[PDB]
Design a protein around this ligand. Sequence first.
Ligand SMILES: CCCCCCCCCCCCCCCCC[C@@H](O)O[C@H](CO[C@H](O)CCCCCCCCCCCCCCC)COP(=O)(O)OCC[N+](C)(C)C
Ligand SMILES: CCCCCCCC/C=C\CCCCCCCC(=O)O[C@H](COC(=O)CCCCCCC/C=C/CCCCCCCC)COP(=O)(O)OCCN
Ligand code: SF4
Ligand code: SF4
Ligand code: SF4
Lengths: 210, 99, 303, 176, 70, 96, 156
Amino acid sequence: GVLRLVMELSGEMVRKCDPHIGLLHRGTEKLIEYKTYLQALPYFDRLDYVSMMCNEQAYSLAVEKLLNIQPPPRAQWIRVLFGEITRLLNHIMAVTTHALDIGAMTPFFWMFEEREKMFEFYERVSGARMHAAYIRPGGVHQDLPLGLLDDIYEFSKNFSFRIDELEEMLTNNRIWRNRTVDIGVVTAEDALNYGFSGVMLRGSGIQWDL
Amino acid sequence: MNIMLTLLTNVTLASLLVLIAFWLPQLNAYSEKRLPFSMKFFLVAITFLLFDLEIALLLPLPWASQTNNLKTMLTMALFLLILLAASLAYEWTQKGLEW
Amino acid sequence: MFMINILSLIIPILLAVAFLTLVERKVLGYMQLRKGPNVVGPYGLLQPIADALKLFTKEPLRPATSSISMFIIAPILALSLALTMWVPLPMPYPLINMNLGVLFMLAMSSLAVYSILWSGWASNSKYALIGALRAVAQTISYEVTLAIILLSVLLMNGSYTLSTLITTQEHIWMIFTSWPLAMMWFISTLAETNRAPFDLTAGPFAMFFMAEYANIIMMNAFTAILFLGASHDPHTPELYTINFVLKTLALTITFLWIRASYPRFRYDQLMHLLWKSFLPLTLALCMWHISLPIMTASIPPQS
Amino acid sequence: TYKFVNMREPSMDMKSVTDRAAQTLLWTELVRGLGMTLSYLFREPATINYPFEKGPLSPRFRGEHALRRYPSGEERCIACKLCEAVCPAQAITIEAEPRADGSRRTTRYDIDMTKCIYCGFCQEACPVDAIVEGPNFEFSTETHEELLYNKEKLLNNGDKWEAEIAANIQADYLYR
Amino acid sequence: MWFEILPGIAVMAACLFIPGMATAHIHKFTNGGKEKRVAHFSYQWNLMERDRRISGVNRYHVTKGLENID
Amino acid sequence: ELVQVLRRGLQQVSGHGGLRGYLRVLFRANDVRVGTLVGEDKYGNKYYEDNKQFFGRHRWVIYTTEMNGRDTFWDVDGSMVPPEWHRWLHCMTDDP
Amino acid sequence: SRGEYVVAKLDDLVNWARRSSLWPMTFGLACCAVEMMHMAAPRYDMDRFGVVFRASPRQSDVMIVAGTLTNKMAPALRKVYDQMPEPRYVVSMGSCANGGGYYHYSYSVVRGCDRIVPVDIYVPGCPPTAEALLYGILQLQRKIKREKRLRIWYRR
Ligand SMILES: CCCCCCCCCCCCCCCCC[C@@H](O)O[C@H](CO[C@H](O)CCCCCCCCCCCCCCC)COP(=O)(O)OCC[N+](C)(C)C
Ligand SMILES: CCCCCCCC/C=C\CCCCCCCC(=O)O[C@H](COC(=O)CCCCCCC/C=C/CCCCCCCC)COP(=O)(O)OCCN
Ligand code: SF4
Ligand code: SF4
Ligand code: SF4
């Protein structure tokens, strides 16, 4: 995205790296204080735009915990299904862009076609491709379109071949390995003490998944 | 004469193309508003220069193969390539090819 | 009618490099499950003309403080060398029949680096100067192995004349006699023109682009002549011209394929690649190709 | 349950070492990647021919706003100001007064389309289905001021898109 | 589909067709329907100069056969 | 094989009313596909479908050359489609 | 007369050349950049219109502002716009760039990118779909086609 990086080097090697942030500081947390909970829900779509539905689920769970209520089972199953869809969307974007920065740039298009299909699913379920605001603090906004589940099954039965193509282009390539192997090695203790979570933990051998 | 004319034509075509490229958008009015000195670059340049000199020594090889002194010519060519390899090995072992 | 021959050598090369952009765009698009330009022109054909016209009508960003002399000189040298390197090539009859055609090619290729040096120097930016220094280092490092591989291959031809390369490959291609040197030559030519995976780096910009694309096409044609020897019957040279053009096109499309297939190296990674894998093997194979004709009594004729 | 992704050990016998050396010296996986890209070249692209072809949409799609009216031709909006109260972006401005016949109608109804976040909260807070978010999305503009809609513009949008808007509402109102 | 790339490639090929072919034809036109004489090593040049001297029209490509032996 | 695809291309040339229509459609829409005519529009737009194409290419519109006040042989845009054909074309419904 | 005919045809040619190859540099500030990359995806294929992907600032014709412009970022965007050669165009994408959008009443957000740079096309939506951004690009192409410079020079 947008980023400023002030770094000191001694020749080729990086000596110090200080990142400057705040170029996308909009003041969301202060704006939330002037809205009701429903009005404050759409901000979480905009927080982490790559995976919009996951952000809303977190907020909805917090509000449900504070309200002492629980969603019905079908709402929970829909939320988990769309959370996994959003994880697919997030991972495709993350892996492809990372590869694109390195210079691969073909799997970006290959997998953004699938991303377009998942955006079609988002639009069918909510009417919005990205900033859906589908997951509410009482469940979900609306029931699924009569034909949505069959299309989701049709999409998800062909995705393994796409992942296989990505792996064939990237996994065993010697240039990709030389670019990625032994880069940014972090120990388990340093990862835990620095506040890391997710893959950044699991990449170091720490067995943790919420 | 032919080669000089060809080079002259190439230079003239490039110069004319650059001049029109620089002066076609200059006729219309517009708004019209350090120290580091990395050593390894110098070292790789010097290594290139030395290897270039040894390549210059190696160049007459295609004509060197018709001499009736095939043993001596083969020995001298192999000696030159062995010395090139020895220079490369010395630069490799003494950490001259690092970053 | 020599001037007509010079013009008929120059202008078609410029047209070919103008449409190579279209070919690259369409090829990359179709390897990316999309299309290339297909709106401008019936099949996207009029895209290069629109690109050129737009580039030549756009305001040029002179640095306003740098050396104007070198700012103008660098594209002149680049394009002049790019057009000059085409004259010794026999297709099947060269425009200029040099005795030492290979050495003249090597000299022009070595000259091609002053354009990078002067452009980086006249950029008036420390970061661009650093990038230019890296580019020049890569260029010189790889032309070392280019020259060594070239002499090793030519040891089987008997001279530096490119016309004799057709006679050498009358029966069999040179790819069979030395495929490892051919693979190393292909990678070195990729690294010479700053093409992926070695692509670490208005008007004058377009002219630099034309110089690079002409260099790419010329390098692929040189590879086709050196390693894929077409058959030339003296009573109909159009057959040789057809074969040579087809092979050059295949090699250029292979360049586009390679660009679309791989990620790019780091600077130290490709430096190490050259200096620790190509140079030792290049020296070993140079010794082998010196020894082989004497061992097998197969020394080429001319002296 | 956990899985190991990179916990393999290469075999050190002569055949496997020779295979790895052949891969190094002949670039087998590089040709594999080349071949996959080549195979990808020879299949149909996924590009549609816009603007002559359009991407798929759904009745729930939220695009340009519109104000609807009853089949008699009377506007549905009754100035309840629920859409204005629920608007997360404060993009709706409403002023009302009794009409000549005593009806409860708005005299000012503006939507700032440069403030709107297109969440559709206004059309689900409306109790009379007056304000809706139509299916039009190709309404780009050359100036900022034309994106500041008033009551006349929204009423014109409703009169312009009523057929398609009503069809979409008919298709999707049973899910609401 | 993929064959939509063929037109531009074709054009490119046509361009690469022009230079070499042109050279050949010019070498036929300026040498009396024969290939341009290759003159390395200074002996072929001597032969060409002798042909030019004995041609009678100051053109090396005008070959003189037994009909000129009288 | 090759013969079948060249024959299909010849039929595509034939199905646009000759060479003139083929060139007109090629230079107006950058596409020369032939499909069953589904609808005619009161402004002149024509709407075709082809269910054997993949989703997104199975429906299309050839725009009229003259809308309310402007010549539209070249300057076309997606905002010209009337709302009902807008619904059918965007696959919000299966019924023209 | 022929004098105005020549400049009219030259205008047509130059306008066709300029609009048939638009090289955009995109300010991927926020979530609207995602819809830009989807407009660059295989389905819509901006490159097929002559609109290349991620041009350099020194060789870009059109600037696409896709995201929220914050007070900390405005000078950088203005500098990048000033570095751009002429003729240059700006497209404002999304509510955040058009007028601030969801963060309009914020202490650290510029209320519209047109406080900093002039804007040619405003693409509405939060975010606009890839089809919407493509429509905006084609509208900018039509706007470029409408313009007339040699004629203005000739009658002045
Ligand atoms: C040999 C000497 C060279 C010197 C420099 C000369 C430059 C090269 C000359 C070649 C120019 C090529 C022109 C081809 C343009 C035709 C494109 C045509 O199709 O445009 C259409 C017609 O529009 C315009 O009428 C075309 C104007 C083109 C120029 C008009 C005549 C200019 C000729 C003057 C040449 C003399 C030059 C003298 C000084 C150099 C509109 O299409 P467009 O809107 O895009 O796209 C819509 C997309 N749709 C259709 C899919 C929906
Ligand atoms: C009995 C007498 C025989 C005489 C001797 C013959 C011996 C022959 C057997 C050995 C020769 C093989 C050598 C050929 C070249 C080897 C170079 C090489 O292997 O380098 C690789 C690296 O090479 C590359 O990675 C280059 C890849 C560049 C990317 C582009 C891919 C190119 C592949 C596409 C097809 C290539 C087409 C080649 C032929 C074209 C002809 C026109 C090693 O690097 P790393 O794996 O990183 O490890 C080094 C640190 N330990
Ligand atoms: S869609 Fe949301 S932001 Fe837009 S006017 Fe309606 S309530 Fe306000
Ligand atoms: S919610 Fe409906 S009826 Fe109430 S003010 Fe808004 S548009 Fe009018
Ligand atoms: S304009 Fe809308 S979609 Fe785009 S970044 Fe801003 S809030 Fe997100």
